[PDB]
Symmetry: D2
Subunit: 116 residues, 4 copies
């Protein structure tokens, strides 16, 4: 997969299921254009956002809708969302995994980048 | 001091010094308007961003310019910046510390919200 | 898998490959008895440590040999190892994933626990 | 103050107050001998563990009793405790801050090592 998003819940020790994720790409006029979106599965994973052909060079933003996730579990969390902003594919195609671990007042995020 | 930002470096085991930090407040037209900014001190801290009178309820974004920090250290990083987006909420007196721990391909962030 | 260990490198944005992992189980005399060991694969994963039958109730320690990992990459890190100590299977068999994200002066660890 | 421990709570967005912390120093027979201990303050901090004269080079372990902390909050946790194991190294003057951010199924820890 060229782009995969994985979200975990540090309170429950589980994948974070049904988390909305929106991806944007910076356009030539410097605005954030919608690129792809989806929801995490029962494994906390979101696959199928894009294809190698579509996922050209650019600056991308992955917005993870953490507030809605916590609210539905009865928690009023600190953050509106978790955002991950990065340049992709500027030295040719890569595969990106964006992972996030969520707590009500914190999050950690990392990237795993591999060359296919 | 109702808002403080603290930035640490997980590669060097040190405060992240001279990191640019920009704070924005969401306007009624849903755009981000500049609110305060500065550079972290030798302790990785940025104080004096705002006052109690000015820091009213609303949605705020703290951008930390991590890419320029890593570039200055000669280390290739993943993210363009780290972003922390949250709502300020008057529920009694409040002080907010936004902390971030930086690595080249990762960051962790937390909020410590206390009442003096 | 009843027990899986996954290790990532926050400096390189990659799995942490060839990391030694030692698992211990607390014995009746309160000493740490060797239980299983192995090394992470090219995907940063270590599978096959134990079986559902062997992995009885108990207190377990997963020791990840982070210092050796960093030293081989030219970094003199802070920690000797990362240790994860937990009670397992005390409400019946579960599947455990122990994940760790490594930096030279930091680590983050989480657990994902699922009921088969 | 050559050694300070700071503990934060990612569920409540607060310092982790009244957490027991035990420090050990590895003896020549390779056992862990008690060195210092205390409970975190209302700021999540534990100062006064040791002195410059006493804190000689060696291998130290900081155990943070996270399970009892979560139990007191009525939250089921994963870990028995969080452990931080490191070597103290005289390379000019040094102060060590060991910080930990706690969630029920996760923890993050970093070291900030500075020269005053
Ligand atoms: O530097 S301080 O010890 O004052 C601190 F505020 F506690 C802190 F270390 F920065 C921190 F807030 F704990 C912290 F940096 F956020 C931290 F939580 F400890 C951390 F471990 F670094 C971290 F969790 F990774 C985070 F910074 F949140 F990313
Ligand atoms: O490899 S997977 O993406 O399936 C994963 F195990 F979930 C993971 F990526 F390793 C992960 F656990 F999510 C993780 F990336 F390590 C993570 F939890 F998100 C993490 F952010 F790296 C982390 F929180 F720091 C962890 F180190 F796992 F605690
Ligand atoms: Na290029
Ligand atoms: Na039982």
């Amino acid at each position: 997969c060229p782009l995969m998003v994985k979200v975990l819940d540090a309170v429950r020790g589980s994948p974070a299921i049904n988390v909305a994720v929106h991806v944007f790409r910076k356009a030539a006029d410097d605005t954030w254009e919608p690129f792809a979106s989806g929801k995490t599965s029962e494994s906390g994973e979101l696959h199928g956002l894009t294809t190698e052909e579509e996922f050209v060079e650019g600056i991308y933003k992955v917005e993870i809708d953490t507030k809605s996730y916590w609210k539905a579990l009865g928690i009023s969390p600190f953050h509106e969302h978790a955002e991950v902003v990065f340049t992709a594919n500027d030295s040719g195609p890569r595969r990106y995994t964006i992972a996030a671990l969520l707590s009500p007042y914190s999050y950690s995020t990392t990237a795993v980048v591999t060359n296919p």
